[PDB]
Amino acid sequence: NVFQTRAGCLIGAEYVNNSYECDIPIGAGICASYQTQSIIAYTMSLGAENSVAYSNNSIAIPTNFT
Amino acid sequence: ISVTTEILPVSMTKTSVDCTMYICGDSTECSNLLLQYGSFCTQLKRALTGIAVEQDKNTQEVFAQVKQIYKTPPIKYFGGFNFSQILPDPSKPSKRSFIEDLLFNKVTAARDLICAQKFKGLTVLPPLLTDEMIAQYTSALLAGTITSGWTFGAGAALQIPFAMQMAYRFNGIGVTQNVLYENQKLIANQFNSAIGKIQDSLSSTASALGKLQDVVNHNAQALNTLVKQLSSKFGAISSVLNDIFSRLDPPEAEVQIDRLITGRLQSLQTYVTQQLIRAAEIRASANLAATKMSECVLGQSKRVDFCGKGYHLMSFPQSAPHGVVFLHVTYVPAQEKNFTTAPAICHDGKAHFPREGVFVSNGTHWFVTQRNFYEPQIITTDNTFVSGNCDVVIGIVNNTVYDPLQPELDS
Amino acid sequence: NTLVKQLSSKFGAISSVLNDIFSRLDPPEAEVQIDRLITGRLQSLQTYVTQQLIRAAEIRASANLAATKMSECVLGQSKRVDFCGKGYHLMSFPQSAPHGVVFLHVTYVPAQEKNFTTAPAICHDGKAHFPREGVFVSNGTHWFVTQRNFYEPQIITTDNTFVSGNCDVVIGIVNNTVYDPLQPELDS
Ligand SMILES: *[C@@H]1O[C@H](CO)[C@@H](O[C@@H]2O[C@H](CO)[C@@H](O)[C@H](O)[C@H]2NC(C)=O)[C@H](O)[C@H]1NC(C)=O
Ligand SMILES: *[C@@H]1O[C@H](CO)[C@@H](O[C@@H]2O[C@H](CO)[C@@H](O)[C@H](O)[C@H]2NC(C)=O)[C@H](O)[C@H]1NC(C)=O
Ligand SMILES: *[C@@H]1O[C@H](CO)[C@@H](O[C@@H]2O[C@H](CO)[C@@H](O)[C@H](O)[C@H]2NC(C)=O)[C@H](O)[C@H]1NC(C)=O
Ligand SMILES: *[C@@H]1O[C@H](CO)[C@@H](O[C@@H]2O[C@H](CO)[C@@H](O)[C@H](O)[C@H]2NC(C)=O)[C@H](O)[C@H]1NC(C)=O
Ligand SMILES: *[C@@H]1O[C@H](CO)[C@@H](O[C@@H]2O[C@H](CO)[C@@H](O)[C@H](O)[C@H]2NC(C)=O)[C@H](O)[C@H]1NC(C)=O
Ligand SMILES: *[C@@H]1O[C@H](CO)[C@@H](O[C@@H]2O[C@H](CO)[C@@H](O)[C@H](O)[C@H]2NC(C)=O)[C@H](O)[C@H]1NC(C)=O
Numbered sequence: 001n002v003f004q005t006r007a008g009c010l011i012g013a014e015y016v017n018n019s020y021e022c023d024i025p026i027g028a029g030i031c032a033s034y035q036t037q038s039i040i041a042y043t044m045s046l047g048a049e050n051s052v053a054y055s056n057n058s059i060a061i062p063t064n065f066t
Numbered sequence: 067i068s069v070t071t072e073i074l075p076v077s078m079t080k081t082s083v084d085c086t087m088y089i090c091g092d093s094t095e096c097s098n099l100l101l102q103y104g105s106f107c108t109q110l111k112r113a114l115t116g117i118a119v120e121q122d123k124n125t126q127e128v129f130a131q132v133k134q135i136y137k138t139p140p141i142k143y144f145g146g147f148n149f150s151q152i153l154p155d156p157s158k159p160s161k162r163s164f165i166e167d168l169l170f171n172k173v174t175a176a177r178d179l180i181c182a183q184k185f186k187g188l189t190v191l192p193p194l195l196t197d198e199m200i201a202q203y204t205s206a207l208l209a210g211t212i213t214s215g216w217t218f219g220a221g222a223a224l225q226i227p228f229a230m231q232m233a234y235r236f237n238g239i240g241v242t243q244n245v246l247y248e249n250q251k252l253i254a255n256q257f258n259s260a261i262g263k264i265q266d267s268l269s270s271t272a273s274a275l276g277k278l279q280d281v282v283n284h285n286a287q288a289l290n291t292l293v294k295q296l297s298s299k300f301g302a303i304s305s306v307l308n309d310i311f312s313r314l315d316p317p318e319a320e321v322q323i324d325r326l327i328t329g330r331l332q333s334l335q336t337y338v339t340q341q342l343i344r345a346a347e348i349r350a351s352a353n354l355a356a357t358k359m360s361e362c363v364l365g366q367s368k369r370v371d372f373c374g375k376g377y378h379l380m381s382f383p384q385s386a387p388h389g390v391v392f393l394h395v396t397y398v399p400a401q402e403k404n405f406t407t408a409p410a411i412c413h414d415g416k417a418h419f420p421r422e423g424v425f426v427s428n429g430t431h432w433f434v435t436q437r438n439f440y441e442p443q444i445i446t447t448d449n450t451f452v453s454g455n456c457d458v459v460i461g462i463v464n465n466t467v468y469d470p471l472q473p474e475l476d477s
Numbered sequence: 478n479t480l481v482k483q484l485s486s487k488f489g490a491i492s493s494v495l496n497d498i499f500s501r502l503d504p505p506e507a508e509v510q511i512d513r514l515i516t517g518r519l520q521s522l523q524t525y526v527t528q529q530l531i532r533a534a535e536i537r538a539s540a541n542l543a544a545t546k547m548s549e550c551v552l553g554q555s556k557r558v559d560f561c562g563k564g565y566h567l568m569s570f571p572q573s574a575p576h577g578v579v580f581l582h583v584t585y586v587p588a589q590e591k592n593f594t595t596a597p598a599i600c601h602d603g604k605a606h607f608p609r610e611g612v613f614v615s616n617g618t619h620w621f622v623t624q625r626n627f628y629e630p631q632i633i634t635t636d637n638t639f640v641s642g643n644c645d646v647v648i649g650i651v652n653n654t655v656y657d658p659l660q661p662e663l664d665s
């Protein structure tokens with residue numbers, strides 16, 4: 001296959017629409033890995049997505065330690 | 067309440083050099099002759115690759131410090147503080163803020179210089195992280211510090227109202243919470259005015275980003291001198307080698323070629339050494355920036371003149387071309403007044419020392435007050451402790467102490 | 478290894494060894510080849526020394542950082558964030574390794590959080606009450622005071638609260654009762 005990235009042209013890798021942690025950095029936010037029996041090039045995932053409940057009169061207090 | 071700006075460089079520009087094109091051009095005879103000098107280019111490639119990976123390591127260490135990406139809730143009330151200029155703006159396609167846009171715009175037929183340098187074997191590689199990812203990291207850090215506080219730097223993010231967070235920080239610097247709870251509106255107005263002044267200064271002044279511009283200028287000057295070195299004879303007949311080959315016989319052409327090769331190799335060596343030194347300095351700056359990010363943004367620092375000039379309250383990060391910008395919010399006293407003091411109070415033949423504050427007098431009476439704010443109170447046994455008689459301490463004075471129990475005995 | 482391998486270069490001379498150069502050419506002419514070889518080898522060795530100096534400087538910086546970490550994290554307790562580990566620092570231990578040190582950091586991390594409703598101050602008898610070293614919480618029916626980093630509810634009293642001003646200036650104040658521990662024993 002052929003793929004056009006801002007770092008050039010990539011031949012031999014198939015582009016997928018998922019996102020994983022980077023294994024081999026190619027550049028411009030594009031990384032590559034060996035998975036599935038094949039080589040897949042993907043876009044980096046910064047991390048999990050979270051939201052915090054904020055209001056005038058709410059607090060969170062811990063009840064245990066480690 | 068004061069807001070101060072700090073600028074720190076983080077990374078550099080990644081470069082790659084092609085030996086054969088730079089030295090021998092498009093001549094095959096020089097290409098054949100070059101092999102005699104051994105392995106002089108594998109070392110150069112290794113050094114440049116090391117610098118290139120070092121830059122990405124620097125950026126990742128500085129910015130990637132949060133495991134989860136947070137978002138601010140749609141409601142934008144934070145106790146009167148605006149924050150609308152430093153939070154992401156969804157309208158623009160870059161998902162950036164006003165100050166970030168100003169900072170990026172601040173630092174900047176015919177053929178472009180980049181193409182001309184590329185056509186001689188000097189190329190620039192792209193960084194691993196785009197600007198959007200750095201913006202997302204900055205937004206996540208801002209959301210975490212606004213909503214959770216410093217709890218997200220040591221575990222899970224626990225929500226807390228902004229006013230109570232400010233009260234905790236005031237307690238940290240050494241002032242009680244009632245000051246904030248009674249001057250919330252004034253503090254919010256001061257913060258908004260300071261942010262507006264920062265806006266005006268950024269929009270007007272164009273010389274506050276010197277360090278990143280100096281980095282860019284140094285890189286440009288190094289490339290310029292490397293390119294200019296190609297047009298010097300080094301003691302030969304001419305710089306152009308085809309004329310040397312055509313004009314005169316091989317016996318002296320070999321000497322001329324050797325002179326040119328030695329000169330160009332020496333120039334490349336000098337360039338690599340200067341690049342190594344500059345990269346070491348940039349890495350030191352990046353380490354300092356990472357430490358500052360971990361100490362001033364994810365917590366409160368007691369160190370003096372580290373996270374701002376004054377008493378530190380908190381800080382905010384923003385991105386910049388090849389660098390980071392810190393907005394420090396700090397506390398400074400004003401409108402001071404003179405008073406008369408004593409070290410202890412001798413009452414009932416016993417010495418009395420304050421528990422938290424200091425003793426003051428306004429001319430006739432005596433009070434106890436906190437250190438960083440004028441708030442007098444009557445000297446009682448609840449805010450005083452006794453140790454020994456009053457004939458040893460130098461400078462003790464006479465007064466009376468109030469006991470909150472005897473009034474209740476008779477009433 | 479690369480310094481050793483550089484010895485096979487010719488640097489434009491007729492051979493990579495000296496004895497054959499001295500055993501094939503007259504003294505008037507061998508000088509140019511000897512000069513070329515000597516200059517090349519000197520340049521290689523100088524480059525090696527310079528790179529060694531730069532690497533030594535970096536190692537010195539790392540050693541200074543390790544010394545500071547040993548001074549603060551091990552011999553004492555550090556309040557710096559993310560310096561002696563992730564979390565709240567408790568203590569640390571050193572161990573040795575070939576050309577390096579290994580630090581084991583023992584730290585404290587909260588877990589098992591729970592939601593609560595809070596107010597900044599309590600209005601009682603026309604006066605505002607603020608916590609001393611805690612925070613006000615409520616479980617939907619009653620009110621308590623608890624420490625920040627652990628759950629330990631307690632009854633609001635005079636001993637753990639202080640008063641300043643009226644209750645018509647603080648935003649978010651609520652009405653409740655503050656228990657006086659002097660009258661009940663006085664009236665008994
Ligand atoms: C805090 O967590 C510890 C474990 O991380 C809890 O200890 C366990 O509690 C469960 C349920 O009470 C018991 O069945 C286990 O035997 C306990 N020990 C272990 C090793 O699992 C502890 O109870 C938690 N604190 C509170 C207040 O529940
Ligand atoms: C926060 O700051 C923004 C921008 O400075 C304020 O929006 C301005 O509001 C005034 C009047 O309310 C208008 O005249 C301006 O045109 C507005 N500017 C922009 C850029 O929108 C906003 O009022 C401030 N306060 C809050 C609560 O958002
Ligand atoms: C505290 O007292 C000092 C000394 O009395 C004041 O300093 C003097 O202030 C007057 C102005 O009223 C000046 O003319 C003198 O020159 C000052 N003396 C010196 C040595 O500088 C000081 O102003 C008082 N504090 C305040 C807040 O007024
Ligand atoms: C020092 O502070 C005392 C406060 O105790 C002042 O005394 C008060 O003065 C006002 C005058 O407006 C009277 O109405 C109050 O009754 C006074 N208080 C008491 C307890 O009698 C005093 O004026 C201040 N200044 C000096 C120089 O003593
Ligand atoms: C503070 O009060 C004490 C009360 O005992 C003073 O002590 C006496 O003061 C009188 C008056 O000058 C003297 O005649 C006594 O000799 C003092 N007694 C002793 C044991 O020294 C004390 O002087 C007062 N403080 C000041 C600064 O005068
Ligand atoms: C909020 O906390 C109070 C204080 O503990 C709870 O009141 C107690 O609830 C237990 C539950 O069985 C009773 O045995 C006690 O008699 C109650 N004490 C008092 C003084 O009423 C209350 O139940 C808690 N609320 C909720 C919703 O859990």
Ligand SMILES: *[C@@H]1O[C@H](CO)[C@@H](O[C@@H]2O[C@H](CO)[C@@H](O)[C@H](O)[C@H]2NC(C)=O)[C@H](O)[C@H]1NC(C)=O
Binds near residue numbers: 600650651
């Ligand atoms: C706490 O109690 C006071 C009374 O001690 C409440 O003040 C009353 O507020 C109502 C309005 O809902 C007025 O009509 C009354 O005149 C007020 N009383 C007095 C004596 O001024 C106060 O509202 C209570 N707090 C809350 C949050 O409801």
Ligand SMILES: *[C@@H]1O[C@H](CO)[C@@H](O)[C@H](O)[C@H]1NC(C)=O
Binds near residue numbers: 055143648
């Ligand atoms: C409570 O939060 C709402 C938004 O959820 C806000 O409009 C209101 O002003 C807040 N109340 C106080 C007292 O801050």
Ligand SMILES: *[C@@H]1O[C@H](CO)[C@@H](O)[C@H](O)[C@H]1NC(C)=O
Binds near residue numbers: 053590591592
């Ligand atoms: C607190 O309430 C929010 C509101 O949805 C919830 O997401 C969160 O899980 C709650 N916290 C706990 C500890 O249950």
